[PDB]
Symmetry: D2
């Protein structure tokens, strides 16, 4: 095809994996290219505000233009998904969250809270180790096996007495990776269990999750996972790739 | 330098989330349908773009998400506190938003403890032309692009919602005064005061949303607290 | 007919929750310290009264609760729906309150869905002289008792909070117009419209609490919906 | 002492037990007095608005004056207790409710909801069978054993697969009745457990309860019951009889 656009893209990819910044060196190493031609391409991107330089520190990181490319698109997928959330939420009378992956942590883009007396409540915009959530697992699975080992940077945090370890985690990732859905049982907050499925949108990967008290979970896991799959099918039908 | 052609194309696609015909792309950017086709193909190979079927339409692609996500989820995570702070200094609701065409999008928000309060949900839309936040963002728009959001004739939400004329005129004012406001232009009884955030990742709006009742009195202190917060936030996250 | 003496004593005690000296009780009611002592003793035998130690003070007792509780918890349970209904007809917050001296007490409340909303918690106090609810209740007060709540000189919550004079004058008006209102007399920017509920268990206040912003326009329809609700509720729970 | 005031009082007592109304007959039977002298006393009370007649139906029920006697006092106890609630709530980071008995159902006068993710949420002003709640048990215990058999009108409702039956219920009432506190484990809402203690105020009996997910309850019952007792001691010190 065209090799230089692909070089550029590989560089962007590299920068998006390291939000704090990269040295021209480190960029050059990650991508399979010489510090020189890299410098060239960076410059090209910088001319377009797709990248910025963190001072004479010779560091680089993503730039302004990015926002304006993505914003509308994103604000639309969300706006389109919102209803599909409420629906699900009211079919199951359980809280549901829509999240995206940001390295080792997922990020909650949206959420509907259950009316129930025994309820699970969290705020939009919250972080939480991907390794401990159903959503996090569902996203981690879809990760290219090369990239995966980035999020699984050596050893995992442990949030409860059930939080998986790298081994059982990967092993299970293999399972979700073709079973379609994932779950967590008191692996994040003791007494809470979640059930998530992947959303493959044209804009990237999202996680659709049900978050509920384990108390009530043990009984209806069956119906939960199903409603999730139905919602995945719908949503993707309307917004997939 | 073909990189710049590509970039111009991406820019074009981000302005039209529903999709563009190879033709329309070719026209918007100053390039021939052919070389454009070429570049599209190049991007498509990278999932930076997708084709809406034999419809010959194109729109943004998967890779995008994975580029932006972390960065974004960080700016937000970093700004969140700066919101609470402001919120508690003024005891008024505050929202952080971004522009999506003619509508702003609320990324985050803190609601006032107060008895007479203004309450809205995260993830809400609202015509940019009617909000302080929307004005602050619209101002920063390149004057070429501006006329996109200001497509033809504005909606009118109240008996005060500005019209294209007074709107642009005022945009010129905010565009160097630094901040913007709206007085019962969105919801009657509500007034807002916003300022621009120029982050390395793009433009955001930091806004105070409050009952006009309480606004008429303290506009002065509001605008100031906003500017102080802009200075802080940008000091820590600017470009 | 000694039953009436007793009752007068209870009445006296309910007006002074902190307690009364046998003396003060004797003076308030038109009876001699002696026969009063007698009756107190009789009531005390029934736990309708208690003695605040050798301090010779007296105040209400345990049995009271068990007499009232069920009845009360029923009126409330019966009124709750009538609240929601009203709330959704007007899309404005509504409160059900009772009088406790100079302050009203919010027994229940439904909060408006709206963006510009008024929010308060159940169980809150607020000077009766400043609320529509408070006025509606104060009106129904026997003119003798009234001068108890209107002890000397009123608090002033805003730059509109009435003064004893205009207050009484207006009480005369509500006292046969049926309903009362307050315009930024409690919290600036908030206005309320209340009506009396004459239940078999006592007097309640049914009120709409809303932003003045939105009030100036629809006072008319508010007062009407209130009256309709009063008529219904009383039809089902009046005396 | 004085016998007629006591006759009257007995009548009031009778009426407060039957909020819907009593026939002069039924009143006469409940209290140990003749239909005649009862009629007399009723009349005396009616002159004072302590009672009303439900029409020629010859029925009677409580009256207006009542409210004005109790209101202030009540609105004060509540106002005084409110803080003691928040305090407790924040010491345990669990929801707490203040309730009173209304026959077979308790009535929630006030409540503070936990900040927590797995939380229990209910509205003020709610009813719920006393036989199924810790609060309800605590109040039922304090009931005179004669009166008790009113609330325990034959057979109980059953809210869960754990809701006690009249037998185990009474048996347990004997226990709380000198242990001081009561509890319910998934007897009201499956997954929810509560721990309550009695408040003996000068104005009557109240229930102070902690309501939490059983999940989190099994672990800290111990500390809960203690904080409850401490709060009872405080509150009563300030508002007891």
């Amino acid at each position: 095809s065209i090799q230089v656009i692909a070089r550029a893209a590989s560089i962007m990819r590299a920068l998006g994996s390291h939000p704090h910044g990269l040295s021209l060196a480190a960029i050059a190493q990650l991508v399979g290219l010489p510090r020189s031609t890299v410098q060239r391409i960076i410059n090209a991107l910088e001319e377009e505000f797709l990248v910025e330089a963190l001072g004479p520190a010779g560091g680089f990181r993503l730039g302004p233009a990015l926002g304006q490319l993505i914003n509308q698109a994103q604000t639309d997928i969300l706006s389109l998904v919102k209803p599909y959330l409420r629906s699900l939420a009211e079919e199951l009378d359980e809280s549901v969250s829509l999240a995206s992956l940001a390295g080792d942590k997922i990020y909650v883009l949206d959420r509907i809270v259950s009316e129930r007396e025994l309820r699970v409540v969290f705020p939009i915009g919250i972080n939480v180790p991907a390794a401990a959530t159903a959503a996090g697992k569902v996203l981690l699975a879809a990760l290219p096996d090369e990239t995966l080992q980035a999020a699984l940077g050596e050893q995992l945090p442990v949030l409860t007495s059930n939080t998986l370890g790298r081994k059982a985690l990967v092993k299970q990732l293999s399972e979700v990776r073709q079973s379609g859905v994932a779950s967590d049982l008191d692996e994040h907050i003791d007494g809470v269990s979640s059930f998530a499925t992947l959303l493959d949108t044209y804009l990237g990967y999202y996680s659709l999750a049900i978050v509920m008290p384990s108390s009530r979970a043990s009984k209806q896991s069956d119906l939960i996972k199903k409603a999730l799959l139905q919602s995945k099918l719908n949503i993707e039908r309307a917004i997939g790739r």
